[PDB]
Subunit: 116 residues, 4 copies
């Protein structure tokens, strides 16, 4: 599991559960190709998006569907989604944890990058 | 000032100056059409992106080149850029301030939306 | 304006108005001596806390009553208050902007420090 | 383990390791009494601060020594420490995870509160 995403709800002080996300990888022609997808568990975490073999060097984009999450709570939020765009594995394989901290009109995103 | 972007440097405790960004508007075929652009001033602010007449309902994307900012300071950052994607003006004109608070491995973005 | 505090509401996407705060300065016996206070304006800003002559080297604490702010909106928040503790003016006068970005279960605070 | 604190370094994209913190609890006379202390592990986490039996209702203050952390890296940061002040267990026993995301001139703190 070289890529994990964790999402927290800053309004309720809880993991953000059942948050969908779509992961793209930039292709050779500079377009976004589908890479992986899933939704967060009861812990706010999404594990198992990819494998060490599949997660090669590249530019990846994680699109977190924050709008659906807020709308289901009756909140009309600002953002369409929370986006995270990054180059991965440029200097060899790494493990990435992406955290997203969500409020209706604000989000933060942080990466913890470790060398296995 | 229908749309203003303010960028702060959370490492140095200063406005983030000379930060380049492009703004796009989503087209009917889901592609991103060029809309506005500029770079932040010595106050970290970018004013004059659009006018009220031009800034109508749509999904807008602000792509902030945070990578170039950090690289100019000799820091290898995580993100390729900071993206802010939002629907604007769906209830008629509003004034939007997008704030971005930058660190090498983390950013936060917040919107202040006011009715004229 | 040697010390200014700006407070934003990350749930509603607005300045946080009428937010009360007290500023203290640490005494030689480690107790907190009253220094300044006020509440944020309709722009979310609190100006006029001190003057350059009065604002000398020390450890300062800004105690922002975020709990009362959320309770007035019918939200039970996590924090009793948001505290910002920092040494100021140890290299002579500077100008300080303290920003606080508020959510019920999360806050961020950033400083912008400039040399006059 | 009803209280856990996790600290992340937003400059380096890593857990903040060996970060000291001191936890106080407000006494009946409105003074801060010592409650617990420790430092973060290699994962950025501090477990075992207290027990279910000892962690009664009260107002608690976690003081995270962020200044020593940055200084050891050669950075002169803004804050003396990152503070988290909260009422715990007001409606029965809960489990608290406090996360702190650190930059030299900015920090965020978020709580995840769960019912066992
Ligand atoms: N694999 C895969 C996959 C990638 C994307 I981008 C998706 O939106 C979905 I649904 C699946
Ligand atoms: N923001 C944030 C954040 C909160 C928790 I709890 C984490 O484990 C990580 I990694 C990041
Ligand atoms: N965080 C933050 C923040 C700081 C400043 I100085 C701003 O003007 C705005 I808008 C947001
Ligand atoms: N128990 C305990 C304990 C509480 C505090 I506050 C401390 O600063 C130390 I050192 C230990």
């Amino acid at each position: 599991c070289p890529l994990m995403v964790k999402v927290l709800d800053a309004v309720r002080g809880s993991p953000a559960i059942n948050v969908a996300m779509h992961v793209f990888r930039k292709a050779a022609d500079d377009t976004w190709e589908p890479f992986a997808s899933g939704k967060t568990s009861e812990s706010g975490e999404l594990h198992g998006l990819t494998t060490e073999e599949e997660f090669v060097e590249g530019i990846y984009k994680v699109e977190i569907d924050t709008k659906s999450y807020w709308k289901a709570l009756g909140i009309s939020p600002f953002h369409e989604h929370a986006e995270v765009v990054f180059t991965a594995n440029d200097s060899g394989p790494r493990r990435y944890t992406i955290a997203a901290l969500l409020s209706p009109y604000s989000y933060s995103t942080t990466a913890v990058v470790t060398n296995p």
